[PDB]
Amino acid sequence: TDGGSVFSQLVQSKFITLGVEKRAKSYVEDFSNGTAGALCKRPWAVVRYLGI
Amino acid sequence: TDGGSVFSQLVQSKFITLGVEKRAKSYVEDFSNGTAGALCKRPWAVVRYLGI
């Protein structure tokens, strides 16, 4: 029912601005991101070599 | 020129909000209230027992 996608990278977000805090003589900003790694769904379609 | 009521509860306010402070990753809100206790305006209409 899904696509082929032998390898998939699970990313929730790449760049989120948390907020801005303003002070008397300075200000601070925050950023964040989320990920879950890589997932292999069809191991029978992968061939790998260790030494060169 | 008054409601009588013998007893009275002096409440300045039940629930008010003071201010909101917003930070980079959270925010804080504050609340307050005021009261003055109970007042007996007609002490000639009260009878009470210590025991029981």
**Neighbour count for residue B2 (Cβ, 10 Å):** 6
State the Cα–Cα distance between residues A18 and A16, nearest whole angstrom: 6
Structure token digits, residue B4: 């009588």
Chain A interface mutation, best of B20, B23, B26, B28, highest count of A Cβ atoms under 10 Å: B23
- B24 chain-A contacts, CB cut-off 8 A: 18-21, 28-30
State whether the Cα torsion A4-A44-A35-A14 is positive or negative: negative
State the Cα–Cα distance between residues B31 and B15, nearest whole angstrom: 7
State the Cα–Cα distance between residues A12 and A34, nearest whole angstrom: 5
- B23 chain-A contacts, CB cut-off 8 A: 19, 21
Structure token digits, residue A19: 């907020």
State the Cα–Cα distance between residues B31 and B17, nearest whole angstrom: 4
* A52: amino acid identity, one letter: I
Resolution in A: 4.0
